[PDB]
RNA sequence: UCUGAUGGAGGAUCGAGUUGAUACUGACGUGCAAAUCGUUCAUUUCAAUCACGUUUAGGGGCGAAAGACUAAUCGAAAAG
RNA sequence: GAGAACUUUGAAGACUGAAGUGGAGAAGGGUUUCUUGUCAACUGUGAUUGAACAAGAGUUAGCCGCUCCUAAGGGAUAGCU
RNA sequence: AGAUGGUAACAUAUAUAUAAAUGAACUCCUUUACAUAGGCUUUACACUCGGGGUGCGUUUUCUUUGCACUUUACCUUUAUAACAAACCUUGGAAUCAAUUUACUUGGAGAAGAGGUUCGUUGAACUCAAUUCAAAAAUUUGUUUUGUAGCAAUAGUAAUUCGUAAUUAUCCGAAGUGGUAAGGACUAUCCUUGAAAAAAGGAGGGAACGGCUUUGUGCUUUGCUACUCUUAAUACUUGUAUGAGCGUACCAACAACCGCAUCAGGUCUCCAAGGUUAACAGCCUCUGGUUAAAUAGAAAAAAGUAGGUAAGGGAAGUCGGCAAAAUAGAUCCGUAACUUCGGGAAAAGGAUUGGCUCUGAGGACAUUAAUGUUAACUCAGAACUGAAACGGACAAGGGGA
């Protein structure tokens, strides 16, 4: 099952660097309680403007959002950015107001 | 209370009407005023 | 285990009330609360509902009787006399 | 409120002169579901056709003196 | 005297007065709103906000 | 004749609330108050408690009786 | 606003803690409700506040009650006193 | 001139709407219509838990995270399903059986097998429909729909775009038993726990189609669409649908009674999380306030509501008044005396935290093994700490 992040708007303002984000995602993603897994159960790839998560295990879109938020907090982009649902499989960064 | 007899309601209305002060123009040609909290109608 | 030795049914009253009175109550209580033999169905199911009323759970027939026992001896005697007559 | 299942019964009801208004509703189902409501003087009869084309046909069939309400 | 306005906001939204945020900037604009429709408009604008519920976390 | 359960009886027990008012003879005593406040205490399935309605009226009523109470009035109300 | 410890708004910090100064009602109250004013006195301090004062305005039912029935009871009819 | 089914319990009119199942006098019932206590069950709301979906919150560090929303009304005798009863048919029960938490019941017919009804409940159940394929004169198999209609068009949480509109969400599992209601019961009484209006049922069998003609409502003669029943309509007759009254607000915190905006008094319903036996007390969320006939500054005496005091322990005092001590629970242990019921929580002891484990107690559903999985309560063992633990709150002093 595919889950998406349309990272365009802040990626095209340089402030968002997809490569770092991908790494962060890799680090974070717990699998039955351990971060270092990400085996045959989850895959993460990236376009220039889009992050892709594909899951075989019970996985929550909420989790992705949370991760994104965490990332934002880390890189100080909290008052500028927002995670928003577009389509059911599709999350997207949007500018705060 | 919030469920009055018609007669009682009418009486209340009358009392209210009585309450209002002299129309000022007359003064150019009251002691019986009442306050709902200090003097009861004893109805 | 059997709880009371001499008290029996009057265990609800406890310590209060003269012991003699309680003893008397006990007999009367026993009389009241025993399922009497119904002289219609045969099943020992006639129980006291009111003061002088005795209803059976089987027939639903209300039989007039004594206050505590279903039949007072005097009444029985009277009945017997009538029968003889 | 009343639900209807006999198409024929529904038709009969429609044919009846106390039926001033009709309603037709479209619902995205969890395809396009369609409710046919007839509003009689005493009851509002409703038929749920799961199949769009059939629903459309039935609507077409409905007397053109009915005062049809397209809700959505 | 924003009393009335606050009251109106309370009813319209379904929240208690304790929960309406009237922005201290544009207190003149708000006081002018003597009606429920106007209150609604204000809310839409973002000159009146439903305060966030005080948190009661089950976690512990 | 005992033993373990079950059972859920009782004007039983403790006890919030409620109804009261034991003590401090506490505070207050030109008070918050013409009887209040605080702490303590008694009461809580019954002779229970409360509401509304209703009955009984003054040498009368009502009283689990204190001459109690009968509109802050009682060993005979109040009003004229 | 002339003037603000006790008007209003925001931000804190707090209490009431579902036997609540929360919702609804009954008795009793009777316009206390609401808006616009507004401060002589009153609001035992102040007060621009107000259950104050002034002008208006507000209570919409075949279904919620009363309206009907009977209860403890009451007022009477016939009498009789 | 007045239906039918069903062995029976009893059922049947599903017309837009179950409208219609002759019935008079005169009767007989029933509903209305009923105490308290105890538990048990079922539903409902409430609360909670796990997941998915939305938005917000935290992010030095940690957290698949914390919070919020995920809604569904009367009405349709709602259709059904499920269950406590009651009844019917079959069946014939000692080697007594069925059975509840409890006892209750059974040759006056039990168990079992099949039914009927009322009552809860109100979409449970494949409920309905649809997709077609096979079997008789309609039934079985599969699929797609529907928050069963109401119903999504309404809410709620979002997201936008515009100066009101679109869009996406609205749902898969379960536990706690706090309320409330119902049910079947059981117990208590020298207490046996309203009445009527109104409605219903039954017995009973009075009366009996229409039209035309003739004679004095009655009788005779001839003919066959008639008696019902809803809804609609048209027409006359007074104008042939809904009379009047109450509805603000307060309900005490300043709207009531206490001479007042007086710490008093004044009836009822709703009732969240935590800790807990608890609707106790303590703290929190929703809602509500941050006000109370005053503020500020100092911080003497004295007062008042409190605290705490070495050693002693009632020597104080009319008198242990006041205060302190005691207390929750589990385990032990329990005298005199007694009306044998109690005394009794007698007296008097011991234990209690946190952490990490272990054992004990179910439900289903596969085929005795294997699974999915649910509370909370017990009991025991380590370790741990300034020897502490009903750590606050709450909570008997006891005896002769
Ligand atoms: Mg009144
Ligand atoms: Mg007064
Ligand atoms: Mg005294
Ligand atoms: Mg004193
Ligand atoms: Mg003094
Ligand atoms: Mg004397
Ligand atoms: Mg003041
Ligand atoms: Mg607090
Ligand atoms: Mg407190
Ligand atoms: Mg209030
Ligand atoms: Mg006002
Ligand atoms: Mg003043
Ligand atoms: Mg004003
Ligand atoms: Mg006035
Ligand atoms: Mg009514
Ligand atoms: Mg009459
Ligand atoms: Mg009478
Ligand atoms: Mg008389
Ligand atoms: Mg919608
Ligand atoms: Mg009102
Ligand atoms: Mg109002
Ligand atoms: Mg007061
Ligand atoms: Mg007075
Ligand atoms: Mg005051
Ligand atoms: Mg000392
Ligand atoms: Mg000593
Ligand atoms: Mg001495
Ligand atoms: Mg001395
Ligand atoms: Mg003492
Ligand atoms: Zn019998």
Task: Offer a quick outline of the entry.
Chain A has 97 residues and is an alpha+beta fold. Chain A is 30% helix and 30% strand.
Number of strands of chain E: 2
Order of helices and strands of chain E: HEHHE
Give the helix level of chain D as a range of percent: 25-40%
Share in helix of chain E: 40-55%
| Radius of gyration based on Cα positions of chain D | 11 Å
From the spread of the alpha carbons, the general shape of chain D counts as globular
Amount of beta strand of chain E = 5-15%
Number of helices of chain E: 3
Based on helices, strands and strand pairing, what is the structural class of chain D? Answer: alpha/beta
List bound small molecules.
magnesium ion, zinc ion
As an assembly, this protein is part of a larger assembly
Number of strands of chain D: 5
The SSE string of chain D, one letter per element, is: EHEEEHE
**CA distance, first residue to last residue of chain D:** 20 Å
Shape call of chain E: elongated
Strand order of the largest sheet of chain E: 1-2
PDB class: ribosome
Keywords: Ribosome, protein synthesis, antimalarial
Entry title: Structure of the Plasmodium falciparum 80S ribosome bound to the antimalarial drug mefloquine
Chain A: 60S ribosomal protein L22, putative
Structural commentary:
The structure is cut from a larger assembly and holds chains A (97 residues), B (43 residues), C (85 residues), D (72 residues) and E (60 residues). Chain A has 97 residues and is an alpha+beta fold. Chain A is 30% helix and 30% strand. In chain A, a hairpin with a 3-residue loop joins β2 and β3 (50-55). Chain A is globular and about 35 Å long. Chain C is an alpha+beta fold and 85 residues long. Chain C has two helices and three strands, in the order αβββα. Chain D has helices at 7-15, 52-61; strands spanning 2-3, 21-28, 32-39, 44-49, 69-70. In chain D, strands 1-4-3-2-5 form a five-stranded mixed beta sheet. The structure holds three RNA strands. Chain B: It holds the Pfam family Ribosomal_L39. Chain B: Keywords: Ribonucleoprotein, Ribosomal protein. Chain B: One of its GO terms (cellular component) is cytosolic large ribosomal subunit. Chain B: Belongs to the eukaryotic ribosomal protein eL39 family.
């Amino acid at each position: 099952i595919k889950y998406v992040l349309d990272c365009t708007k802040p990626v095209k303002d340089t402030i968002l660097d997809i490569s770092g984000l991908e790494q962060f995602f890799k680090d974070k993603i717990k699998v039955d309680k351990k971060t270092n897994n990400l085996k045959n159960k989850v895959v993460v790839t990236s376009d220039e403007y889009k992050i892709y998560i594909t899951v075989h295990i019970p996985f929550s879109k909420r989790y992705i959002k949370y991760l994104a938020k965490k990332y934002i907090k880390m890189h100080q982009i909290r008052d500028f950015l927002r995670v928003i649902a577009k389509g059911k499989l599709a999350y997207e960064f949007k500018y705060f107001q | 209370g919030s469920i009055k007899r018609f007669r009682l309601k009418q009486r209340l209305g009358k009392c209210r009407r009585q309450n209002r002060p002299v129309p000022h123009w007359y003064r150019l040609k009251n002691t019986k005023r009442r306050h709902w909290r200090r003097t009861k109608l004893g109805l | 285990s059997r709880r009371t030795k001499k008290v029996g049914l009057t265990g609800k009253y406890g310590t209060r009330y003269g012991s003699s009175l309680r003893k008397q109550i006990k007999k009367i209580e026993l009389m009241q609360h025993a399922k009497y033999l119904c002289t219609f169905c045969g099943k020992t199911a006639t129980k006291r509902t009111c003061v002088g009323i005795w209803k059976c759970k089987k027939c639903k027939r209300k039989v007039c009787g004594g206050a505590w026992s279903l039949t007072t001896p005097a009444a029985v005697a009277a009945k017997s006399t009538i029968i003889r007559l | 409120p009343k639900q209807i299942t006999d198409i024929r019964k529904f038709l009969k009801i429609s044919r009846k002169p106390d039926t001033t208004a009709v309603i037709i509703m479209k619902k995205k189902s969890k395809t396009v579901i369609t409710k046919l409501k007839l509003r009689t003087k005493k009851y509002l009869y409703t038929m749920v056709f799961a199949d769009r084309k059939k629903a459309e046909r039935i609507e077409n069939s409905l007397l053109p003196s009915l005062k049809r309400i397209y809700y959505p | 005297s924003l009393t009335l306005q606050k009251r109106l906001a309370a009813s319209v939204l379904k929240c208690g007065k304790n929960k309406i945020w009237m922005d201290p900037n544009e207190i003149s604009e708000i006081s002018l709103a003597n009606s429920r429709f106007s209150i609604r408009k204000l809310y839409k604008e973002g000159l009146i906000l439903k305060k966030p519920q005080k948190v009661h976390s089950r976690a512990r």
